[PDB]
Amino acid sequence: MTNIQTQLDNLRKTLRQYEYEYHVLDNPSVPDSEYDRLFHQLKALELEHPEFLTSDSPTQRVGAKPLSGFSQIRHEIPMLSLDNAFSDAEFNAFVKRIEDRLILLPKPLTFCCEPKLDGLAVSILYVNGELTQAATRGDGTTGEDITANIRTIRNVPLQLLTDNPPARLEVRGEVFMPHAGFERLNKYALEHNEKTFANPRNAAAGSLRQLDPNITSKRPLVLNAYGIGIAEGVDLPTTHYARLQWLKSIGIPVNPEIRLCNGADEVLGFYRDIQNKRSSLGYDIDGTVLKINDIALQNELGFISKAPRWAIAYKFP
Numbered sequence: 001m002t003n004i005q006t007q008l009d010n011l012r013k014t015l016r017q018y019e020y021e022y023h024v025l026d027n028p029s030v031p032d033s034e035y036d037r038l039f040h041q042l043k044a045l046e047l048e049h050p051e052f053l054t055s056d057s058p059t060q061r062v063g064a065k066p067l068s069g070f071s072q073i074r075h076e077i078p079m080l081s082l083d084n085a086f087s088d089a090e091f092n093a094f095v096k097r098i099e100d101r102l103i104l105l106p107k108p109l110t111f112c113c114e115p116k117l118d119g120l121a122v123s124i125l126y127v128n129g130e131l132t133q134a135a136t137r138g139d140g141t142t143g144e145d146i147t148a149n150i151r152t153i154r155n156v157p158l159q160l161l162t163d164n165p166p167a168r169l170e171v172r173g174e175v176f177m178p179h180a181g182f183e184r185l186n187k188y189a190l191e192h193n194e195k196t197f198a199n200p201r202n203a204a205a206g207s208l209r210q211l212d213p214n215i216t217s218k219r220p221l222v223l224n225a226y227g228i229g230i231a232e233g234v235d236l237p238t239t240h241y242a243r244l245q246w247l248k249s250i251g252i253p254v255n256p257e258i259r260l261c262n263g264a265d266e267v268l269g270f271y272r273d274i275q276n277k278r279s280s281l282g283y284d285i286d287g288t289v290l291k292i293n294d295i296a297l298q299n300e301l302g303f304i305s306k307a308p309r310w311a312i313a314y315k316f317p
């Protein structure tokens, strides 16, 4: 044991906890200055004793060297697409079809309702709690290795906040740029005669395609986790909301507007509430993602492969 290894371990634990409070809880227990005091105290100490420097330390988010290009990553579990609706009647028909298709329909039929963020879908792998890899969705089967870019995102933890992390956990979410960040970026890019972005989605896309993680770090990007891919060495909750709550309890950012709604009429109230709140969120959304909350019912309903919307095979008993 040394005093150095101990004060580095203590600084790291304290800083990760403050990052959680600030980013995930939105309830920091200390001022921004106090966090910074300890941050650059850890950074200096690590540089004075580089033998105790760790790859997942809060000070190691940004690569010093710009990359040559992005490698391609084939997802172990493919990243699926979403069905869409454009009206109340259309949404009700989607629900009436689920009601008929289920063996046993429960009363109530609970839905996990979330805002649909207007960002870029990503996959982040944590191996024994440590961030090792991150990929763009790409075409749902193959994507690009953006690990260095994802590591710069302030609300993305380099290590899970748990003493018993899964053997492997793949977190799936949307990377996006809030309005304030988007406005500052364009004001800076205008005042420095550089490329301005038409909308926050385009700014987030361009920032994640940046080969120099030093530029991505200057881009005000945010992750909101929506799902889980690989999950080994853990018994995941049996509902979708509880899985998002579990992700949040181990340090992962999830959207705070998520709610549970029983039946289509409650689900439609949520949709109208998010539509009215839309003008005050501080980030772009283009709809609401409505999911069957019970995991066993999701497994029963399963998925539909790439198929036309104009045909159906009505099978005989």
Ligand SMILES: CC(C)(C)c1nc(-c2nccs2)c2c(N)c(C#N)c(N)nc2n1
Residues within 6 Å of the ligand: 079, 080, 081, 082, 114, 115, 116, 117, 118, 121, 137, 174, 226, 227, 289
């Ligand atoms: C895993 C699956 C249930 C199919 C899914 N997919 C997406 C997508 N991301 C990219 C294309 S579809 C979601 C997505 N973009 C959001 C958002 N925002 C969300 N809340 N949930 C999503 N759920």
Ligand SMILES: Cc1ccc(Cn2cc(C(N)=O)ccc2=O)c(C)c1
Residues within 6 Å of the ligand: 018, 019, 021, 022, 023, 028, 029, 030, 031, 032, 033, 035, 036, 154
């Ligand atoms: C100088 C400075 C340092 C930190 C921050 C924001 N912030 C604060 C905390 C905190 N616990 O309060 C944790 C992480 C973080 O990113 C800003 C905006 C400016």
